[PDB]
Structure formats: structure tokens, C-alpha cells
Write a protein that binds this ligand. Sequence first.
Ligand SMILES: NC(=O)c1ccc[n+]([C@@H]2O[C@H](COP(=O)([O-])OP(=O)(O)OC[C@H]3O[C@@H](n4cnc5c(N)ncnc54)[C@H](OP(=O)(O)O)[C@@H]3O)[C@@H](O)[C@H]2O)c1
Ligand SMILES: NC(=O)c1ccc[n+]([C@@H]2O[C@H](COP(=O)([O-])OP(=O)(O)OC[C@H]3O[C@@H](n4cnc5c(N)ncnc54)[C@H](OP(=O)(O)O)[C@@H]3O)[C@@H](O)[C@H]2O)c1
Ligand SMILES: NC(=O)c1ccc[n+]([C@@H]2O[C@H](COP(=O)([O-])OP(=O)(O)OC[C@H]3O[C@@H](n4cnc5c(N)ncnc54)[C@H](OP(=O)(O)O)[C@@H]3O)[C@@H](O)[C@H]2O)c1
Ligand SMILES: NC(=O)c1ccc[n+]([C@@H]2O[C@H](COP(=O)([O-])OP(=O)(O)OC[C@H]3O[C@@H](n4cnc5c(N)ncnc54)[C@H](OP(=O)(O)O)[C@@H]3O)[C@@H](O)[C@H]2O)c1
Ligand SMILES: Nc1nc(N)c2c(-c3ccccc3)c(-c3ccccc3)[nH]c2n1
Ligand SMILES: Nc1nc(N)c2c(-c3ccccc3)c(-c3ccccc3)[nH]c2n1
Ligand SMILES: Nc1nc(N)c2c(-c3ccccc3)c(-c3ccccc3)[nH]c2n1
Ligand SMILES: Nc1nc(N)c2c(-c3ccccc3)c(-c3ccccc3)[nH]c2n1
Lengths: 250, 250, 250, 250
Amino acid sequence: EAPAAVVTGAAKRIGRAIAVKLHQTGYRVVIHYHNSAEAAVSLADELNKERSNTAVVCQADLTNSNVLPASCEEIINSCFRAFGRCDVLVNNASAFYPTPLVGKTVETQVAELIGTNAIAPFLLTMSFAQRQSSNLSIVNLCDAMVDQPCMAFSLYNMGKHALVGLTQSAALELAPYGIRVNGVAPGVSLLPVAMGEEEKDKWRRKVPLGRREASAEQIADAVIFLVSGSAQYITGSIIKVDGGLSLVHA
Amino acid sequence: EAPAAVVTGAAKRIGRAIAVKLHQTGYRVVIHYHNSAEAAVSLADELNKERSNTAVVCQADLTNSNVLPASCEEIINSCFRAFGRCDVLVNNASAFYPTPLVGKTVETQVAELIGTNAIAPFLLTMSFAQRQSSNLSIVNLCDAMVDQPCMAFSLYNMGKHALVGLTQSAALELAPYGIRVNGVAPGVSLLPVAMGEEEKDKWRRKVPLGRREASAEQIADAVIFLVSGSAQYITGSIIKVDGGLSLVHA
Amino acid sequence: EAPAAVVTGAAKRIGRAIAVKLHQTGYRVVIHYHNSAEAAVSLADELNKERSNTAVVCQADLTNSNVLPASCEEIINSCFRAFGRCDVLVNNASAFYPTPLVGKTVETQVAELIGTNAIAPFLLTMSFAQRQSSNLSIVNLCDAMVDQPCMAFSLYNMGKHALVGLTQSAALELAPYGIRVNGVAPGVSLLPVAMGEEEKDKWRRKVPLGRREASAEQIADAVIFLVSGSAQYITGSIIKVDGGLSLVHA
Amino acid sequence: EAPAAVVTGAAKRIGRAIAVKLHQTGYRVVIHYHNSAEAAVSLADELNKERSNTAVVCQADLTNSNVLPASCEEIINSCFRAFGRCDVLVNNASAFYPTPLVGKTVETQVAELIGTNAIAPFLLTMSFAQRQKSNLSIVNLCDAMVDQPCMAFSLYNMGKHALVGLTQSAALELAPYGIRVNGVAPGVSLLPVAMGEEEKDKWRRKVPLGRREASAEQIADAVIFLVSGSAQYITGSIIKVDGGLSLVHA
Ligand SMILES: NC(=O)c1ccc[n+]([C@@H]2O[C@H](COP(=O)([O-])OP(=O)(O)OC[C@H]3O[C@@H](n4cnc5c(N)ncnc54)[C@H](OP(=O)(O)O)[C@@H]3O)[C@@H](O)[C@H]2O)c1
Ligand SMILES: NC(=O)c1ccc[n+]([C@@H]2O[C@H](COP(=O)([O-])OP(=O)(O)OC[C@H]3O[C@@H](n4cnc5c(N)ncnc54)[C@H](OP(=O)(O)O)[C@@H]3O)[C@@H](O)[C@H]2O)c1
Ligand SMILES: NC(=O)c1ccc[n+]([C@@H]2O[C@H](COP(=O)([O-])OP(=O)(O)OC[C@H]3O[C@@H](n4cnc5c(N)ncnc54)[C@H](OP(=O)(O)O)[C@@H]3O)[C@@H](O)[C@H]2O)c1
Ligand SMILES: NC(=O)c1ccc[n+]([C@@H]2O[C@H](COP(=O)([O-])OP(=O)(O)OC[C@H]3O[C@@H](n4cnc5c(N)ncnc54)[C@H](OP(=O)(O)O)[C@@H]3O)[C@@H](O)[C@H]2O)c1
Ligand SMILES: Nc1nc(N)c2c(-c3ccccc3)c(-c3ccccc3)[nH]c2n1
Ligand SMILES: Nc1nc(N)c2c(-c3ccccc3)c(-c3ccccc3)[nH]c2n1
Ligand SMILES: Nc1nc(N)c2c(-c3ccccc3)c(-c3ccccc3)[nH]c2n1
Ligand SMILES: Nc1nc(N)c2c(-c3ccccc3)c(-c3ccccc3)[nH]c2n1
């Protein structure tokens, strides 16, 4: 019987690339999404054409709130409902925007940035563990630049640092259950179409390895390694996939 | 005119030592507290008996909620209303208890642990910066053991990692205003007197330097250095005060 | 045609497992060794029996001295002599023994521990670089416990820290050549066969994931990943393969 | 009776500033130097004019070699011979020049960069500890930028990483003797007066806190803190004194 994986924020970009690689490797997938309903269903369709009844969608807001634990529990539940098991959780969904210290209220900024980058991963990790020759693991999408943060992104950066802490704490606590918990830390990966090509090229020129951003596939390759039998002794590790960006001084 | 400082969780233990030592150095202090009202007031009395009009109290819950930004704005405002300035912020208040992955609801555990240790510090930082020759700084009480966390303390450890992120991010962002942002990271300090003799001895025996915990005053000494004119180029630094504990393998 | 790899200290234990996996993946290998001539010759024989003239041996002391640069240059030369190319360098050889601060002279201890763990890697890196679809990379065998070092192993730990610095520096500097430079950081692996099982068990008991040391093959799996086409944007990254050991407090 | 300190590379720049501040604090000092004889003697003269019999010079090359351990032993011995005690060691002396991977021989580059920055500190630390076999401590001058190194400075960076390892290993091992071991990590400080102005300003512009380099006295300030009675529980800590430089992404 095929194993199953939940990928958060999997309608597009890096999360989709990860869901696709897992599905190709043989996983059944839960494609979680928030607003990108069309994209999520379109991916589920593609994947189901390849192999029937191997993909489902699950909509959830991962903003912090008093019902977030319920939402996270329901994401894990949807994998068990659809596939009878949940082997892998990938925490990929992430809000990202500036929150300067000097339209959204600060309450909202705190809830969205901390919720998606840290608290939801924690609550998904709880639910994944509680609901349990298998190879169970969790992969967190971290950030290679967490110690050299973008100006005015404090809440986003706090969230990513907390996700490091969770990766470590959960690796330690879930080790007795056979559940490995690791991370992948992109540098600069999929640049948005809508960026001034002046601005995209400015990020690209910063990367020592090729003067280019990582492809989604390159990030997903590291995820697939960590979930593989080739990483059976690896837990609490964060693999940077940054082309050396984080090594470059100002 | 004397500079003024806000110390959160200052009614006892390490926060009290930090308030006392700042006061001894010449600061006027706002004693923030949550439940320890009698000890907060008694400290204020003692400090005011020493120099008139140099200490006030400000009560607030720093649990995460939709009213926390206002609570944090009021803590900073209390310094201005009393003393007409606010030169130093010390983020010391902290909830600490286990939150296993497998009475409080999980949403309360998240609000308390992430609120006190990370979000409140962030909102207090926003309010402090927004209100601003001078020697302005912020000191965050971090944790020397953040990469080797206690078993079953994921949320606390998440909060403390986030606080590292805030320290770095706010140092970078506030440096143009001349506001330094640093941290002090205790190991083990002030073991609860009701913790077991076996359990205390076990922690003490692990500390390389002197096989004993730090006094509150030793933690406060590092805070004082960071706020002083002897640390005028220091920003985004976290000083461990741990007797070498974090260096000891399992 | 087939790529070629140099593995230092490859006659036994982890280095041998690395050379065998590389070979199995289709690499031709230089098997470098120092004292273990029988094991190195025998390993080359076994691999050549599998595919004709796909392995060679090369002896060299990698102790620091005035002839170490020529020695290292000759190891890289030996790969080109045998195979006309050198795509991968794995810095695995390592002296490991205590050097207390309070029958070898201290200058010999310095020379062996810093030579094998850092200086020889740097010199090999230079010679490798100087000689250069393509997929070139270096993997350095680091140590997951470098920040929580064994008591009285200062010189070893200094060497391993130096090796981290080389991994970063060389990743930055060799990126323009498309040479990636990464590390693998074992926790406890392949405990000495001669170590009593009861001492083996003291280390084993520390490991959260499975209360077991890593196999040589598990270490080798991380090396294989890093040299593979699935790691082509990864440079300056150190992958811990430690079962959570470095996460455990004293 | 006054305590005594050895400061290596103390004739000029940051070491000189550290020796001066230690002397103003009440220490007698050994001013170690290599080539800057006139500067060293001029400094000793000036400190002795302030307090008779409180400063000596000690010449030694700290390049790695088979006699480096005897040279390091003689430096420590010079302090006991002049003052009858040695309370503080500051490892400040440092060779700094590029060593690219692709007039000095490489043997010499290795001996100078690894000797001065790492091996001499280790040997001096041994001789220090053995002569003690009060508030005894060691301060190592580290580098805030060691994870974002200068292009083509691999050996210097390996040296400085090794020095972090020494700081940690020695703090752990010397703690039972009451000897604390810490570091101060400058970012950019005291630019060579002769460095081109455009290059000076290129570095200055990078620093968030004031867009300027640290003064030598600001670096000394943090050394003075670490040797003081206000840092009695601090060991194995490295204090960055960098104006936020290390926080800035490429
Ligand atoms: N791209 C990079 O260069 C880079 C760099 C560093 C780290 N990373 C990390 O790698 C991961 C993937 O990066 P990316 O660029 O692919 O991510 P992204 O496009 O910015 O976001 C991924 C998904 O997060 C989901 N999301 C956003 N807010 C949400 C909310 N409130 N509730 C639930 N889901 C929400 C969105 O789902 P819908 O579209 O369905 O609404 C979005 O498609 C992230 O964790 C990111 O931080 C990426
Ligand atoms: N003690 C150690 O060994 C150690 C180790 C690592 C880090 N630290 C850090 O050093 C700092 C001080 O340590 P500590 O042991 O002195 O702290 P603590 O005694 O555990 O807590 C300090 C204060 O935090 C306040 N607090 C708790 N929950 C709160 C809430 N919901 N809202 C507002 N305030 C709240 C409490 O105020 P009331 O008493 O007024 O309710 C309490 O007095 C903390 O940040 C801690 O994490 C300490
Ligand atoms: N085993 C662990 O748990 C562990 C933990 C952390 C890091 N690591 C690292 O992973 C790598 C492999 O570990 P291991 O346990 O397999 O290593 P090892 O058996 O201790 O050493 C590997 C080889 O290093 C070679 N070597 C030693 N001194 C040398 C010298 N002066 N010149 C040239 N070669 C020399 C030896 O070659 P000959 O036998 O031919 O003389 C030896 O077989 C090492 O870098 C090690 O530090 C291992
Ligand atoms: N300046 C900065 O911005 C900066 C940045 C990061 C770290 N640091 C660290 O802070 C410390 C002081 O920096 P600095 O700029 O003042 O240092 P520096 O001027 O570059 O070097 C200090 C002294 O090192 C001594 N030295 C060099 N080679 C030697 C050898 N082979 N044997 C013995 N002594 C030798 C020299 O003594 P003689 O003059 O007597 O020959 C020199 O005066 C160093 O450890 C440095 O790495 C400085
Ligand atoms: N959820 C999410 N989405 C993103 N698009 C990013 C990015 C990012 C930022 C700039 C260019 C490309 C990607 C980054 C990022 C952060 C710091 C440095 C580089 C990229 N983090 C992101 N997280
Ligand atoms: N707010 C708060 N209060 C505390 N009492 C602690 C402690 C702590 C944990 C054990 C003994 C003494 C102190 C710790 C702690 C955490 C990790 C390792 C060691 C101590 N953190 C704390 N935070
Ligand atoms: N070259 C070499 N050989 C080794 N055998 C080791 C070890 C080591 C240490 C203890 C048990 C097994 C292996 C370790 C090691 C170091 C620090 C913590 C744990 C293991 N490093 C080694 N390096
Ligand atoms: N012994 C020694 N001397 C030095 N002059 C430096 C410097 C340095 C590099 C550039 C400007 C000013 C100082 C640096 C340095 C290194 C990396 C980043 C920034 C400064 N390290 C030094 N070490």
C-alpha cells in the first residue's frame, strides 16, 4: 500500500513542486491550500489522471486563531479519511510581507505571519503525531537567511526562527516514536513574475552558485531526500539549498 | 535628568534584580508585573524610599490576544507618563511550562508561551521605537539552551527562538535611530526552592563553572553592561551567562 | 564516461563505505590511506574485480609538515593519472585522540590533529581546484557535536571548526567554477569494534532516534546525496547525520 | 598586589588599546609584539611613567613551527618573571592576508595564518593553565564575520573558526580550575590609516549602527567587561562588537 503525505500551501510554486515529486516517488498526497482553489483542484486532477484516487485537496486558513488547532487537526484527518494513513507532513505554507516596527492591523500581521510560519506547523505536528516498516517524517520549509533578515520583516523572521526551534524540539520529542523532523532552507527560489526584472536580477546577482535562484524542483529534491530511506538517521537537521547566498557578506 | 527603563516581569527573581541594578545605576524604572502585585508594590516602595519618584508599577497580562498591542502600548506609555522619557526596554517576562506534542487548552498554551516570550516583546519594541545625547537600547532575555531544548517544551523553545529573530531583526531595523537591540541568555539561574534536591543537584552538577546556578545578580550584570556606554557599538548580540552549560554534550 | 572521486582515509570504516557507495553509483575511486595498506589494497581489488581498473590506492601521511602540500598535490595527481579527471573530493581522513590542556609531543599532536582535519583538506581543495553536464564537488567530513565538544579534545575540535570555515570559504570562492563544497556531520557512528559494548551503550543511550549509532552506510548516503544531481544548488551546507544527538542537553 | 595580563600583538591598534585599558583598570601588563619593537617599548615606557614597574615587553613570532610551544611557554613565563602572577591572557595577535585557492609559500601562509590565529592561542592557553596548576580568564579576539567570510581568505577564516572551537573546548575543560574562556568578535574596527579612502568608506557604509567602524576602545571595552567581576559566570561566550554588520544580507 502506498504511503501518503500532506503538503501545506501545495497549490503552487514550491509546495506544488514538492507534492508532485512525492506523488512521482509513489505517495498519495493531500494538497492543502488557502485561496488558490482553482490551482489546487487543477493539480489534484493532473495527479489523479496519472494514478486514480491518489490526490485530494483540503482548504484551510492557517492564520493563528483559537480554532487553528481544529483546522490543523482536520488537515491531518483529511489524509486519514482519504488514504487511511499519513506518513509525511511538509510544512510549506507561509505568509510573507513586511511588518515595519516604525491595510492590515498589527493583530492581523501577528496572526498571519506567526500563525502560518510557526504555530500551524506546531499544531500540524501535534496532530500528525497523535493520529499515529513505515518511514514517518516531517519536513519544515525554513529560511537560509534567517540570521541576515530582510529589512522590516521582523514577524516573518520571528516565525521562521520559531520554526527552527520547532524542528529541533519536535525532532527530540518525536524521536522515540520513530518520527524524524527536519528542514529545508531555501535562499532565493521562485522569483515572482510581477517583480521588476531590475529587482529579480538584483537578487540573482547575489547568488555565488550560478547567479540564479533555485528552481522549485531543486528545493523539492532536498525535501524528497529527507523523507527517503537515505535519510533514516537524520533528524533535527536543516539543509540549506541556497547556492551559497547566506555566505555572502554585505 | 535621569534615564528611565521598563522591565517586564520585574516583581521578582531575575527581573527584580535587573530593575534593582538599573535603579542602582541611576535609572528610574517601571516595574511591570502580572500576578505578583504585592511583590511589585513592595519593590517600588523600596526603590522610592531609596530615591524619591524613581519607581512605578504597571500591571499587564502579556498573553497573546487581540488586545495585546494596546496593553504593550500602555506599558511604554506608563514610562512616559511617569518619567517623561523611555531610554531602555528589558523584555524579561516569560511563561515557562511543558507543552507535550502528544488544565490549559492548546490555544491558551500557544497564547501564553508565544505571547510572553515573543509577540509581547515585538509589540513592546514597536511601541518603544514609535515613541522615539541619548543611549537607547533594548535587552531581550533569551535562553542559552535554545539549541538543546528541554524535552516537551516546544512552544517555549519556539518563543525563545522567535525572540532571537526579533533581537536580530530589530537591531538591523532600529540601528538608524541609534536604538541598540541585544540579548542576555541565562543557562540555569535561581532554581525554584520547591524543585527537588535531587533535580537541583542534577542541574548544578552539569554546570562546568562552579557546579552551581547563576544568581539573578549575575544575569543582571550582563544586562547592565549592554545598556551601558561600554556597549555603544554592540547591537544584535546575545551574551550567554551560563557557566558553560550549553557547551556540555549529553 | 564515468566520473572519478578521491576519498581520503578510505581503507576502513566510514571512508570505505563512502568509496564503496560512490563506486556502486558508477564512480571510479582513489582509495587514499595512511597505515592501512592491506585493507586499502584489498578494497581496490574487490572494486576492480567488480569493474576493471575503476580503483587505485594512494598512500600519504596527511600530518601537517613542510611536504604536506606536495603530498596533497600528488593525491589529486593520482586521480588524473588513473582516470584523466577528478570530479569529487571527500575529505574523510582524521586523527582523533585527546590533547589535554593540563607519548607524543604537543607539536606532533598539533601537526596530526590540525593537519588531517583541516590543513590537508585545504591543500587538497587547492590542488583539486587548480586542476579544474559537469558536476564537481567537495564533501568534508565534519562533526555534529563541534559546539558541545568532548572533554580534553581541544585540538581535534579546533580542527573540525577549521574544517567548517574551509567548507564555507571554499564554497564561496569556488562557486564561480561550479564546484560545490559541502559537509556531512556524523554524531556517533560506527563505534570502534574494540570498544566494549557497555561503553558503546553509554553513547548509544544518548541518541534520541533509535538509541543507536549511525551505520557507516547511513553517513555515506548523505555524501552520495550531496555529490548527486539532486544537490546541484547546494553549496556551503553541512548536513548533520546524528539521530538527534546534538539536540540533547547535558 | 595588582593582577597581571598578557596581551599578544599589543604594540599597536586593538591590542594596544586593550593593554592600555587593562592598565588603566589596575593591571600590570606584558606587551607582546613581533615586529613593532619601537611601538612596543614606547608603550611600555608610557605605562611605566604612569605607574612604575607595571609594564614589560616580550618579543615572539607566533608562526606555527616546532618551537612555537616553547615560545608560547616563554610569553607566559615572562609575565610570572616580571610580576609573579598571570591573571589574564588576551589572544589578540593575528596575521591577516588573502590566500586564494587557485611572495609567501603556501607552507608559510598556513604556518602564519593558522599559527597566529589558532595554534598560538591554544599553546598559550596550555601554558597559562599549567602555570596556575583571583579572577582568572582568557579572552580570544574572534571575528563577527566568520560565517560570511571575505573572498579568498580561507586560511584566515579557518584560523578564526578554530579559535571559536578553542574558546568552547577550553571554557569546558578549564572551568573546573575557575578559569573562564571567552571571546570578543569585532566586525570592522580601526581601519588602516593608509587603506584607501574609497575602500574605507565602502566598509563604513555597510555598518547599520552609525555607518562607521568600531574604535579600538569600543573593542577593548568588551574585553574589560569579560575579565571583570561582572562576568564571573560567563565562560564560553563570544561577544560580537560589530554595529550589526553581520546581520546585513548581501
Ligand atoms: N521562494 C523563496 O525564495 C523562499 C525563500 C525562503 C524560504 N522560502 C520558504 O519556502 C516555502 C515556499 O516558498 P514559496 O515562495 O513557494 O511560498 P509562497 O508562494 O509565498 O506561499 C506558499 C503558500 O502559502 C500559502 N499561504 C499563505 N498564507 C496562508 C494562510 N494564511 N493560510 C494558509 N496558507 C497560506 C498560500 O496558499 P494559497 O495560494 O492557496 O492561498 C501560498 O500559495 C515557504 O515556507 C517559504 O517561506 C521560500
Ligand atoms: N531562570 C533561568 O534559569 C532561565 C533560563 C533561561 C532563560 N531564562 C529567562 O530569563 C528571564 C527571567 O527568568 P525568570 O526565571 O526570572 O522568569 P520567571 O520567574 O519564570 O518569570 C518572570 C515573570 O514573568 C512574568 N509572567 C509570566 N507569565 C506572564 C504573563 N502571561 N503576562 C505577563 N507576565 C508574565 C511573571 O510575573 P508575575 O510574577 O508578576 O505573574 C514572572 O514573575 C525569562 O525571560 C526566562 O525565560 C531564565
Ligand atoms: N565515527 C564517528 O562517530 C564520527 C563522529 C564525528 C565525526 N566523524 C568524522 O567522520 C570521518 C570518518 O570517521 P571514522 O570514525 O571512519 O574515522 P577514523 O576511522 O577515526 O579515521 C579514518 C582514517 O583516517 C586516516 N588517518 C588518520 N590519521 C591520518 C594521518 N595522519 N594521515 C592520513 N590519514 C590518516 C586513517 O587511515 P589508516 O587507517 O590508513 O591509517 C583512518 O583509517 C572522520 O573525519 C571523523 O572525524 C566520525
Ligand atoms: N581590525 C578589525 O576590523 C578586526 C576585525 C575582525 C577581527 N579582528 C581581530 O581583532 C584582533 C586585533 O585586530 P587588529 O586589526 O588590531 O590586528 P592587526 O593590526 O592586524 O594585528 C595585530 C598584531 O598582530 C601581530 N602579529 C601578526 N603576525 C604575527 C606573528 N607571526 N607573530 C606574532 N604576532 C603577529 C602584529 O604584531 P607586530 O606589529 O608587533 O608585528 C600586529 O601588530 C585580531 O585578532 C583580529 O583578527 C579585527
Ligand atoms: N513565503 C515566502 N514567500 C516568498 N516569496 C519568500 C521569499 C522571497 C523573497 C524575495 C524573493 C524571492 C522569495 C523569501 C525570502 C526571505 C529572505 C531572503 C530571501 C527570500 N521568503 C519567502 N517566503
Ligand atoms: N521563564 C522561565 N522561567 C524559568 N524558571 C526557566 C528555566 C529554568 C529551568 C530549570 C531550572 C531553572 C530555570 C529555563 C530554562 C530553559 C532551558 C534550559 C534551562 C533552563 N527557562 C526558564 N524560563
Ligand atoms: N576521526 C574520528 N574518529 C572517531 N572515532 C570519532 C569519534 C567517535 C567518538 C566516540 C565514539 C565513536 C566515534 C568522534 C566523535 C567526536 C565528538 C563527539 C562524538 C564522536 N569523532 C571522531 N573522529
Ligand atoms: N588581524 C586582522 N587585522 C585586520 N585588519 C582585520 C580585518 C579588517 C578588514 C578590513 C578592514 C578592517 C579590518 C578583519 C576583518 C575580517 C573579516 C571581516 C571584516 C574585517 N580581520 C582582521 N584581522
